[PDB]
Design a protein around this ligand. Structure first.
Ligand SMILES: CCCCCCCC/N=C1\OC[C@@H]2[C@@H](O)[C@H](O)[C@@H](O)[C@H](O)N12
Ligand SMILES: CCCCCCCC/N=C1\OC[C@@H]2[C@@H](O)[C@H](O)[C@@H](O)[C@H](O)N12
Lengths: 443, 443
């Protein structure tokens, strides 16, 4: 029996573009994901978020599933261009109405909302002006955030500024695999920097506009291990942790500068005078959200960008090919405590894609996903016994949904969605997780 | 023999980023090609324009080659961020000095400069604000052009606003193969439209500043032919001509709208009120420059984007794998006259990459390149006999140089450059072309 602390917050998570559909309904502006996915060759099978799970229309049924499973919290994101179709300026009242109904409904049902302000669907109007490459985005994001706070902050008390700024900057602007689909390392590092600047502006206006609220920010993380005991492999791991995991952003927030090995690799790409912005970047936050899915073996590789390469291991893998290493969620939780000692931490995403099917009995028996979640939840419990102030844990995702450049081919839900009919079928993992929440842990 | 008109201009062409090196010397700002080529994975072999042909230091020797060869015109481009390091605002004197010495030197030796204002090296500072995706670029570009007209317009009387706006827009923002490396079809067609607006705005400034000069614009073109007589193949060719050749830009300039078939395909991606800008885009131009390298067999293809695909043919190809179809140059010249009757036309590039070998005699026996140039010059001559107002022909390129995403691996020069020593070796095609110039044609 692994019982969690009293009041621990068990949650499920989604993001706007991945579930909503109806990107241009009710006068909403285009986002960069609408334009990126409508560009041939960017997304597997030419999939787009045009329909997705049709949560734009089916939101009430989806919330009723959260209630039925007795899940305590719901992390979801708001689509910036539904609110400000031009990025700034004119507020779209129908966009407020859509999210107001969701928020009111969650409260009515005793479900705690955690709002992600930005989960990647930048208004296309702002991309035309350079998007995350433009220092002015700190002002644009501050405006958008204030709008959300003044409208929703009387009811929503738990907020997240950015989902995975490393991904937004590096996958979006260096690899070009996510919107806006660019490949320029100087632009990517300026994005990393402007994301931090925008985050800090949002937190500053939050303190002015929301009463009794908490605000945080969410990082992707992997558990990197050395391919050997050679010192250069151990160093490769340190560089991968500093660059790919929370330190890239938490070293600035808590210490006022980038990590040492990131500066070693990337000082050239950062704005000259970037450090002038650090004092404002250190705006105090209430909690750190960590996402965690996978572990990676890494080695020094003299002929690789940043002199590091991944090494494939013979470990169990999900349908993404991602290695399942549950102790990594323990490691990242312990390590964030040791390195930055944030007052509170949440696992804001953990979960897995598997090739789910509906069996002849009409149920979706996804035992692989149960076993994945069970092992990670036990490891999170271990971190708590060792003093990590973990306040909550959110499964990615409530629903199978649009998995970015992989399209609909990768299913992460605890609820299956048949995209031909939009029927929801709660998976075994959903009923299993319902029991975890009921027992406040594993038995 | 095929003698050209009296006063026919024989030239050679280069571009700033492809030959200069020293991208950051003397207060220059970064360009998007510096940051793109310094991003791993974007350019063959990790090649950059950091040194290139070192023309930044060797320009006098290179001009002396043009002089020794008897070539009468030199088309070269100016690096925008050498002149305005932040894209707008403060002018960099040393950048002006660099091009001034080039211009004075050409004029002392009786070589006519043709200046390309924009040959793809956008200031990086402007890319951070959206670059060609941002409407405001018409202003930025008009101001930059003004600075060049004011500083050099006393001496330079032949000007080109943009080199191959189709490539800038489509290859740089839809295929992501050139800087700034993006893949977004909405951004790409915004870029097309803003390039037209910037060009027209520059010509308007030109009329104010350089009263006795001529200005034009340069387009890429291929000679498209249908894979069969099926009607869908014939319509595919008409589409490829309207989209990939001069009509995309000349229909706006001469007729006040995009080509029919381009609108059919792309109205979604163009700004909704794009036609409001057409009157200004009609600003009168003095000449059209046409680039031409290859012919392509095309078919209707239901599975392809735009529903068109290229079909490989059994034809001689260059080391690029580009089909050698010299009658294509005749066709594009006849057709631009038939369709838009520009007052003056110039072939602003024609040339070929071959696997050049320096033999024991210290020479480069590129009969392949001679055969290519000769056939195209003969076809251009035929166009002239039939009434096309072709005023000059420029070989791409004077020098082997940095071939964009191909890096140094592809050599187009009539002069070989050994990059280890920066030694210049005139190729047999260079001696041959010198004779063409001396004879004013083919003998
Ligand atoms: C390097 C190969 C391993 C990549 C594993 C890291 C990707 C795990 N991350 C995600 O896996 C799926 C999930 C996305 O659906 C969610 O929108 C994102 O916030 C988050 O990035 N998500
Ligand atoms: C599928 C298309 C195959 C044919 C592509 C033909 C490309 C021909 N164009 C060029 O070939 C080389 C030359 C560039 O060096 C020059 O800077 C550009 O202005 C110009 O675009 N250049």
């Amino acid at each position: 029996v692994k019982k969690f602390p009293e009041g621990f917050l068990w949650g499920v998570a989604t993001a706007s573009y991945q579930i909503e559909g109806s990107p241009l309904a009710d006068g909403a502006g285009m986002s960069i994901w609408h334009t990126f996915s409508h560009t041939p060759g960017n997304v597997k099978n030419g999939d787009t978020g045009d329909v997705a799970c049709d949560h734009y229309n089916r939101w009430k049924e989806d919330i009723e599933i959260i209630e039925k499973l007795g899940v305590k919290a719901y992390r979801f994101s708001i689509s910036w261009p539904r609110i400000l179709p031009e990025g700034t300026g004119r507020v779209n009242q129908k966009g407020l109405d859509f999210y107001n109904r969701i928020i009111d409904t969650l409260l009515e049902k005793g479900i705690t909302p955690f709002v992600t302000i930005y989960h990647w669907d930048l208004p296309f109007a702002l991309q035309l002006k350079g998007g995350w490459a433009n220092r002015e985005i700190a002002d644009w994001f501050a405006e958008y955030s204030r709008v959300l706070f003044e409208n929703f902050g009387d009811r929503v008390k738990n907020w997240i500024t950015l989902n995975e700024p490393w991904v937004v900057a590096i996958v979006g602007h260096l690899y070009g695999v996510h919107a806006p689909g660019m490949r320029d390392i100087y632009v990517a590092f300026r994005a990393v920097h402007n994301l931090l600047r925008a985050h800090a502006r949002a937190v500053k206006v939050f303190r002015e506009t929301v009463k009794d609220g908490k605000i945080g920010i969410v990082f992707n993380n992997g558990y990197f291990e050395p391919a050997s005991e050679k010192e250069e492999d151990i160093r490769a791991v340190r560089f991968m942790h500093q660059f790919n995991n929370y330190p890239l952003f938490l070293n600035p927030i808590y210490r006022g500068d980038y990590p040492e090995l990131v500066l070693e690799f990337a000082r050239e790409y950062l704005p000259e005078n970037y450090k002038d912005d650090m004092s404002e970047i250190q705006e105090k936050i209430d909690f750190v959200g960590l996402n965690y899915y996978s572990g990676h073996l890494v080695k020094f590789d003299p002929d690789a960008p940043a002199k590091v390469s991944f090494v494939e291991r013979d470990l169990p893998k999900t349908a993404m090919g991602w290695e399942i290493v549950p102790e990594g969620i323990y490691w990242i939780l312990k390590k964030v405590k040791e390195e930055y000692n944030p007052p509170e931490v949440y696992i804001t995403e953990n979960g897995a894609a598997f090739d789910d099917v509906v069996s002849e009995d009409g149920r979706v028996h996804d035992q692989n996903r149960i076993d994945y979640l069970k092992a990670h939840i036990g490891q999170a419990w271990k971190a708590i016994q060792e003093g990590v102030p973990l306040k909550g844990y959110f499964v990615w995702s409530l629903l199978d949904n649009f998995e970015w450049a992989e399209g609909y081919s990768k299913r992460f839900g605890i609820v299956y969605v048949d995209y031909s009919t939009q029927k929801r079928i709660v998976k075994d993992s959903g009923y299993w997780y319902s029991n975890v929440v009921k027992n406040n842990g594993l038995e």
